[PDB]
Design a protein around this nucleic acid. Structure first.
Ligand code: MG
Lengths: 94, 195, 105, 49
DNA sequence: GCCCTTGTGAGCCACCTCACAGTCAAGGCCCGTCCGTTGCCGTATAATGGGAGCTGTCACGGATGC
DNA sequence: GCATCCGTGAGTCGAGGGTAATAACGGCAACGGACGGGCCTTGACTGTGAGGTGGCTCACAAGGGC
RNA sequence: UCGA
């Protein structure tokens, strides 16, 4: 089972909203190359390679953990799409 | 076995040298391409000669091999050769060493006119040559002659024009006819090893 | 052998969908985190056998790969086997001890 | 079929399953990018690679 | 105590750096030329109404018929 | 109102092999297509020519080494 | 004609 799935279901009125939030956040992370993360260097998800510990490539895991932290704000009509995208591209270029 | 057309390459510099080749028919040139775009003829591969020698020692080709005529080549696996094959390869490589060193000497012997005459007479003893009514001839461009006489096209064209005015040779359609073998022989001074 | 390691890197955290015909209810398809194994056989967890009505007398299953981040999210959250433990019909547990487990206990 | 290097059939009941899961983007993938959407599948492959 | 290789210096003489014309050659097109393949008619004894059927459901909704 | 015919349905997914057979012709006419060539539209080569300019050409007078 |  996914870690803290019950608590994640707790944060939303509908599971599907959780899914949408996670997916979209994952899209943000992928688009901006993880440099917009709310996580701390010790909170970063890790993956064991032959070399050793590396950053987890999976953005969904990242998004779910980030959501579990509470530092993310989700809802409807929080901000116009264009303004959001441009401010994100200003804070975290591509 | 594989056939190649004129100007087509058998292998490129820096590419994996997995295959050793032996020229069965035609004429092949081993050349090097400079950053500035100048092309230089390093050596001539004749039927029976082994080339792509980099496959015997390294991992990648160091030079480019280009077919000057319709050519028939045979691909070979270096690791699969017996005593006899290695013997033939050694002897042939020695022959090509002698010929490439003689070519070296040729490149620094005599003025441009002499070098051109010598190269023409050399090509006369290669599959690049043939014969009709006008006399013996060789199918070669001025650019290639420049590449194989340590000079550039323009000067070569000038010297060839001089030879045309003097009646020693005639030219048309990348095709040069050697009308006076004696005169060309005198101009060249020393002959170039054809085998 | 390095491409297998690369393949291990690729599938990290991602899930695949398993399906068995006939698909009578929504648990006819479930999401699983794949663990690469030698051999040509797909390995299925015992507890889900009831929901699939699956057994090992030669039954076959199909695998699907959700491509998008959205699809992956849907699979991991909504479609994951561990997240569906109760029957949507009776409300009773579907994934539960059976056969040998019950026998031992 | 395996002999034609074919893909698996996602039938009516499977679609019903996906609908019951409320997995809309997965279902949409099945109905488009992984099937007869040409521009979609081309762009999808290119995007993944 | 006698060999090997050096350091200038003045002066041409072919050979290389631009800048351009003309020149021979190869797929490409159109022509027409011819030739092969295609479309059309004409066949006048008399001739004058087809031929293969497919059989062991089963239940419902709906139009139709005494 | 109550028999009766007609039309339409009758579980999912996966696996491997199979495919033809035929009775009518010549006498012309003309397109439509294979072919052999000549005019093109470039693309790859010749044939100058006018400017610079390296680096061979060609004799001096000994310095360090073995 | 199979397999589940
Ligand atoms: Mg079974």
């Amino acid at each position: 089972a996914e870690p803290g799935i019950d608590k994640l279901f707790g944060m939303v009125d509908s599971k599907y909203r959780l899914t949408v939030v996670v997916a979209k956040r994952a899209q943000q992370l992928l688009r901006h190359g993880f440099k917009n993360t709310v996580l701390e260097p010790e909170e970063r998800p890790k993956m064991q390679t032959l070399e050793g510990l590396f950053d987890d490539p999976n953005a969904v895991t990242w998004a779910m953990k980030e959501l579990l932290t509470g530092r993310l704000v989700f809802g409807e009509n929080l901000v116009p799409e264009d303004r959001l995208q441009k401010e994100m591209e200003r804070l975290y270029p591509v | 076995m594989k056939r190649f057309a004129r100007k087509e390459t058998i292998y490129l510099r820096g590419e994996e040298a997995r295959t050793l080749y032996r020229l069965e028919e035609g004429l092949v040139r081993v050349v090097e391409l400079l950053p500035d775009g100048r092309l230089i003829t390093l050596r001539h591969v004749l039927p029976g000669d082994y080339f792509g020698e980099e496959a015997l020692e390294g991992k990648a080709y160091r030079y480019t091999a280009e077919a000057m005529t319709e050519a028939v080549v045979q691909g070979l696996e270096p690791r699969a050769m017996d005593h006899e094959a290695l013997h033939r390869v050694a002897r042939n490589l020695a022959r090509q060493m002698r010929r490439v060193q003689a070519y070296e000497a040729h490149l620094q012997t005599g003025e441009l006119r002499a070098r051109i005459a010598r190269y023409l007479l050399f090509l006369a003893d290669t599959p690049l040559s043939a014969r009709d009514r006008q006399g013996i001839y060789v199918t070669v461009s001025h650019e290639e002659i420049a590449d194989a006489t340590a000079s550039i096209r323009e000067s070569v064209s000038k010297v060839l024009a001089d030879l045309r005015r003097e009646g020693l040779i005639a030219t048309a359609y990348r095709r040069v006819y050697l009308l006076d073998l004696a005169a060309l022989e005198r101009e060249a001074g020393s002959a170039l090893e054809a085998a | 052998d390095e491409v297998w390691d690369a393949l291990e890197e690729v599938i990290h955290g991602k899930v695949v969908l398993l399906n068995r015909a006939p698909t009578l209810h929504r648990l006819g398809i479930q999401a699983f985190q794949p663990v690469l194994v030698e051999g040509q056989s797909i390995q299925l967890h015992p507890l889900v056998c009831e929901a699939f009505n699956a057994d090992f007398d030669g039954d076959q299953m199909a695998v699907h790969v959700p491509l998008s981040s959205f699809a992956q999210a849907e699979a991991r959250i909504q479609m994951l086997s561990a997240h569906n433990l109760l029957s949507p019909a009776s409300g009773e547990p579907l994934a539960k001890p059976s056969r040998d487990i019950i026998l031992g206990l | 079929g395996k002999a034609q290097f074919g893909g698996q059939r996602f039938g009516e009941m499977e679609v019903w399953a996906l609908e019951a899961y409320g997995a809309a983007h997965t279902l949409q993938e099945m109905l488009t990018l992984k099937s007869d959407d040409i521009e979609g599948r081309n762009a999808a492959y290119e995007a993944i690679i």
